Design an enzyme around this catalytic site. Structure first.
Site, PDB file in Angstrom:
ATOM      1  N   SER A 173       0.819  -1.204   0.000  1.00 43.73           N
ATOM      2  CA  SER A 173       0.000   0.000   0.000  1.00 43.73           C
ATOM      3  C   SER A 173       0.855   1.257   0.000  1.00 43.73           C
ATOM      4  O   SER A 173       0.313   2.358   0.154  1.00 43.73           O
ATOM      5  CB  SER A 173      -0.947   0.011   1.204  1.00 43.73           C
ATOM      6  OG  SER A 173      -0.217   0.040   2.417  1.00 43.73           O
ATOM      7  N   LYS A 216      -6.498   5.295   5.257  1.00 44.29           N
ATOM      8  CA  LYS A 216      -5.344   6.077   4.833  1.00 44.29           C
ATOM      9  C   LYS A 216      -5.573   7.577   4.953  1.00 44.29           C
ATOM     10  O   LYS A 216      -4.612   8.342   4.822  1.00 44.29           O
ATOM     11  CB  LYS A 216      -4.973   5.725   3.394  1.00 44.29           C
ATOM     12  CG  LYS A 216      -4.920   4.236   3.116  1.00 44.29           C
ATOM     13  CD  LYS A 216      -3.514   3.692   3.260  1.00 44.29           C
ATOM     14  CE  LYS A 216      -3.444   2.245   2.817  1.00 44.29           C
ATOM     15  NZ  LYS A 216      -4.191   1.352   3.742  1.00 44.29           N
TER      16      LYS A 216
END
Lengths: 269, 288, 144, 72, 72, 72
Positions: A173, A216
């Site tokens: 990620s 995030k």
């Protein structure tokens, strides 16, 4: 929370706290995704207030601002704002969601002249190495636009350190995170602090989208980062998040790895 | 021959309990029966002591139910009420007394002052926990005893302590219902028997090593006794009646940051006890 | 007094090449640690003796990385990293503190074996290291 | 685990979490095969014992640490 | 004298217990005995069942050595 | 005479245990012993089987010294 703590210690109508003091307790004395830490921090403030009151009730209503907080707590364990540290050479403030609270993976990469290969430290996974390879492959397509010599892959070893042992998200990620980390390390210029990032990098130089944009976007508020970089393919992923999550952010929706590096690489050569 | 010799040995041991027999002959069932009227006791506790007297009229070395019933009666009649250790509501006096343990430690004294300033400032503005008792944490060689002793000296509490660390059976923590011997009133009941003032300081020693082969977790009793809304109703396997423990203060010590059950993280918190240095050891040696 | 049960030999750094003093702690008493690194010209791979964990491995890798970044600052060749097997003795196993707490101690232990010069007497140390050549803050300074 | 209390109030039920953190066998979710006094059932029967109703809001907190390093 | 008296009293209790309506017998045990005797079953299976049935008559209620037999 | 009186004493143990409660586990540990030491086996193997059977004086309800003993 505060009206519970100041009721734990019998401070009914005795201690008042302003917004700035609570923000100081939030951003200077605890860093976790939940609000468990603030419970104990405000409890300690309540206990110190009860102590100081018990040795004399001079003031009718004691106002605790962002100035007298240390008197009850001591030393700020964490920086007030993350926009005050420095720009560093081989630092890229990643983003991740560790099951114990979001935190920024400070992936650190060092470039040393030598044989030319990838030194793989810090308990990488397979996907982490593939992401590093993808970042190098894109950076090889365009080298003279980043000040690098075209023979860098032939003669430079890269030592890569990823914290949290193995991959914390159990999946890649931090594509553009490693892209900017390696670009700065190879160019030996200070990468930009104060901006976290996440994405996927694809060898044509494309930022494939991430999963769970909410995490995030939170794990950068908790870390105190107020400028986040996201893939453009998640533009519609910002149309269901609550307005509170989007408050305070200057989000740079990006699609290439030529525009993530517009921000961080202010010094190119 | 060996079996008969061991049988005669245990029976002669039972016989040679003359001191216990003398108490049973006169004090038990007679003085204890009048002891109800002589001292102040709750009505329900008095009447249950009356049944405990009715549980007597048989030898105490025979059926162990009668033995444990007499133990209940002895731990009942020797716990008076209507008396309490006086408070010192001044943190300054407590600091003054703290000045002479070694010197106060300059850190832990302040945390204890936090705990005391909260202790005097509660919903009833009195000694009610609704909060941890802040076990001490540090090396075993430090003056862990000195902190509790100095606080008891300042706060004017008759300091106690009970054996809770390293135990492996639940009769020194909870006990088990008065239907068989080997199940005894808990050490908290013994400490409450030690003095009649209803605000003692029952120091719990080495809580981090508390365990038991008796399955059935004593940590439930820890939650029961550490909750002031449940410590008044603190029962165990042994405690068949909710025994009124309202104004009882508490404190605990430990020496490890890992060996502790998680049900001992709420209503419980850490006080770190720093180790001493060669200069600190020099000063404390020379002076005390 | 009789036979001395304790010794003053834990107040010293033992100024020999490769020897270094790492400050460690336990929540029940005080202790320290020592390390010695032998730089035998070989295959250039890290051999850890003492049942050490991996954390010492990447800490030594970071130390060697910083050495390789500025070989010219200590008069070192640019290729001897492939040729020097580091044979490390540490009396304890893994570091009691989480991660590296003797990171700079390990860095100097590795550099001493690659610089042929001993350690300094009565000078202890502790700290964390970063691959970029920065020392990270160490927590629990009181115990250390 | 305060959201559990909120839902419980909204439903006028009880609420009793049972932390499974530190469980590595069926001898703590189920019980030991009862063969001697000195062994409990698992955790859920203790949970139901703590509350007094057949319709609580059980919160199986820390279910990820539920592991198995032992037979079972 | 008291110990021999209580020993004889306990023996009286035990002797009367076997004659106290046989409450433990049949209701808590022979119910399984009938189910063995009423299922169309291979001969060796019945032989094994009777072999494990004769292994009983010792109190598994305080002994784990025959709870396995009851569950078997 | 001595080397046979040892086995005779073992046999007396196993035969008196018949009259003892449980009937020597329904004549168990004698089926194992005879199925070992009637089928033609090497003598050293018979002896070591005797020892490895003598380890059946321990607990069995989870201890790895009687389950593995029974399997062996």
């Amino acid at each position: 929370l505060w009206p519970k703590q100041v009721r734990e210690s019998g401070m009914e109508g005795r201690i008042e706290v302003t917004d700035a003091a609570i923000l100081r307790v939030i951003s200077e004395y605890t860093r976790e995704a939940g609000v468990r830490g603030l419970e104990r921090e405000l409890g300690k403030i309540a206990r110190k207030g009860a102590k100081f009151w018990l040795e004399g009730a001079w003031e009718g209503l004691r106002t605790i601002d962002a100035s007298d907080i240390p008197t009850y707590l001591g030393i700020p364990r964490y920086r007030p704002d993350k926009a005050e540290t420095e720009p560093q050479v081989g630092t890229a403030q990643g983003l991740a969601w560790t099951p114990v609270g979001g935190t920024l993976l400070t992936i650190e990469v060092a470039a040393v002249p030598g044989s030319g290969k990838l030194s793989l430290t810090g308990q990488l996974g397979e996907v982490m190495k593939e992401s590093a390879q993808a970042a190098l492959t894109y950076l090889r397509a365009h080298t003279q636009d980043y000040g690098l010599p075209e023979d860098f892959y032939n003669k430079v070893d890269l030592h890569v350190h990823v914290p949290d042992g193995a991959t914390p998200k159990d999946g890649p990620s931090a594509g553009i995170t490693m892209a900017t980390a390696i670009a700065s390390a190879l160019s030996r210029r200070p990468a930009r602090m104060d901006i976290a990032m996440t994405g996927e990098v694809s060898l044509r130089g494309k930022v494939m989208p991430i999963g769970g944009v909410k995490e995030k976007l939170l794990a950068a508020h908790q870390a105190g980062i107020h400028k986040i970089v996201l893939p453009k393919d998640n533009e519609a992923q910002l149309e269901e998040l609550p307005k509170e999550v989007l408050e305070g952010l200057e989000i740079k929706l990006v699609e290439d790895v030529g525009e993530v590096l517009e921000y961080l690489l202010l010094p190119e050569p | 021959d060996t079996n008969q010799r061991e049988y005669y040995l245990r029976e002669q041991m039972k016989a040679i309990q003359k001191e216990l027999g003398g108490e049973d002959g006169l004090s038990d069932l007679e003085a204890l029966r009048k002891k109800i009227e002589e001292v102040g006791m709750p009505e329900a506790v008095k009447t249950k002591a009356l049944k405990e007297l009715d549980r007597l009229e048989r030898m105490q070395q025979g059926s162990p139910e009668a033995t444990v019933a007499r133990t209940y009666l002895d731990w009942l009649t020797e716990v008076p009420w209507s008396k309490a250790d006086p408070e010192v509501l001044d943190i300054n006096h407590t600091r003054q007394v703290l000045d002479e343990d070694h010197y106060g430690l300059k850190d832990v004294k302040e945390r204890i002052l936090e705990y005391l300033a909260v202790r005097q400032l509660t919903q009833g503005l009195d000694v009610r926990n609704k909060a941890p008792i802040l076990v001490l944490v540090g090396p075993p060689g430090v003056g862990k005893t000195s902190l509790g002793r100095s606080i008891a000296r300042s706060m004017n509490r008759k300091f106690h302590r009970i054996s809770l660390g390293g135990v492996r059976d639940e009769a020194e923590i909870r006990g088990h219902r008065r239907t068989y011997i080997g199940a005894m009133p808990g050490k908290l009941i013994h400490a409450m028997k030690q003095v009649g003032v209803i605000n003692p300081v029952i120091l719990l020693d080495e809580i981090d090593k508390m365990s038991s082969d008796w399955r059935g977790d004593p940590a439930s009793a820890m939650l029961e006794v550490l909750d002031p809304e449940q410590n008044n109703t603190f029962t165990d396997h042994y405690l068949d009646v909710p025994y009124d423990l309202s104004k009882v203060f508490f404190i605990t010590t430990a020496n490890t940051l890992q060996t502790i059950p998680r049900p001992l993280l709420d209503r419980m918190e850490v006080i770190e006890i720093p180790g001493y240095t060669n200069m600190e050891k020099q000063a404390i040696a020379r002076q005390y």
